[PDB]
């Protein structure tokens, strides 16, 4: 199996084999000559201010450390295109955990939505402050030992120079109203976790009866929430959910609201008044 890239670096190498392919980015089976573990050579679709922002943020990704993220190695444009270096993840993500299992167990839900909100603490405390942009259940990769969850996919990341982030980017199913308008901070991957436990908590796409995503964007900038919202069995986390979709994002729950909501803690016994 011969290498056919190299990064700049010189450490990690590309081969041509294509794990899989989404709507702007395709994972190709890299290796860490460092460490001659595999990772994830991810190829992304593409001003001289834009190029040189670029080339920052790469370098404060490049280092972030924290439990509940997936590491990014490195990044660059190539030749047209982005190329990502990341952890190959190999246990599948929460999508595939619920495609496979349907039904995720209130303890399982609950251990790794405290850990997803672990890991937007940590984007979100950064210097500068770090959106995420793209969070949905299949951005969430299990990691062995002990299932751990860490966030992943940075490609559509932003680092908060300024009080507000602009461009339209993102998973439709899984983004703010107050995107489409422009003029949106870190409340957005509130709202793609809410997106994210209602995934969780009923197993399908939110907004799945739309046709196409501009039906989405007429729902939500309109303030009507998702059919699937009203299937969601557990009181609790339908509040949670309505919590975190709502339209006004200074109504929204805050990271450290739901880190202390007692809901993320009930498992320490019986439930009691
Ligand atoms: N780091 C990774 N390691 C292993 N497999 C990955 C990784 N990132 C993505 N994949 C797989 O590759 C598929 C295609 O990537 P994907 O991220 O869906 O492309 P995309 O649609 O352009 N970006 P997204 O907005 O997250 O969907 C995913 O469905 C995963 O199964
Ligand atoms: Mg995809
Ligand atoms: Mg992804």
Redesign the pocket.
Request: with cysteine.
């Given at each position: 199996m011969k290498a056919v890239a190299t990064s700049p670096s010189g450490r990690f190498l590309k081969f041509d084999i294509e794990?899989?392919?989404?709507?702007?980015?395709t994972?190709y089976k890299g290796l860490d000559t460092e460490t001659w573990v595999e990772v994830?050579w991810?190829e992304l679709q593409d001003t001289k201010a834009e190029q040189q922002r670029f080339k920052e943020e790469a370098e404060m990704l490049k280092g972030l450390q924290h439990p509940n993220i997936?590491r990014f190695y490195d990044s660059w444009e190539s030749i047209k295109c982005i190329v990502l270096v990341?952890?190959?993840?190999?246990s599948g993500?929460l999508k595939t955990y619920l495609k496979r299992f349907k039904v995720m167990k209130p303890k399982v839900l609950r251990s790794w939505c405290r850990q997803i909100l672990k890991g937007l603490q940590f984007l979100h405390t950064r210097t500068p402050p770090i959106i995420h942009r793209?969070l949905k259940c299949?951005?969430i990769f299990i990691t062995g030992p002990t299932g751990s969850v860490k966030i992943?996919?940075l490609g559509l990341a932003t680092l908060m120079r300024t009080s507000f982030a602009k461009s339209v980017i993102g998973?439709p199913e899984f983004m703010a109203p107050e995107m489409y308008e422009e003029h949106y901070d870190e409340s957005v991957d509130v709202y793609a976790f809410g997106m994210c436990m209602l995934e969780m908590a009923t197993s399908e796409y939110p907004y799945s009866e739309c046709q196409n995503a501009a039906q989405i964007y007429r729902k939500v900038t309109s303030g009507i929430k998702p059919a699937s919202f009203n299937k969601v069995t557990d009181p609790e986390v339908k509040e949670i959910i309505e919590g975190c979709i709502r339209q006004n994002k200074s109504e929204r729950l805050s990271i450290r609201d739901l880190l202390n909501h007692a809901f993320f803690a009930e498992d320490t016994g019986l439930r009691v008044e």
């Open positions: 794990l899989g392919r989404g709507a702007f980015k994972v994830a991810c997936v990341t952890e190959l993840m190999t993500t793209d299949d951005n992943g996919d998973t």
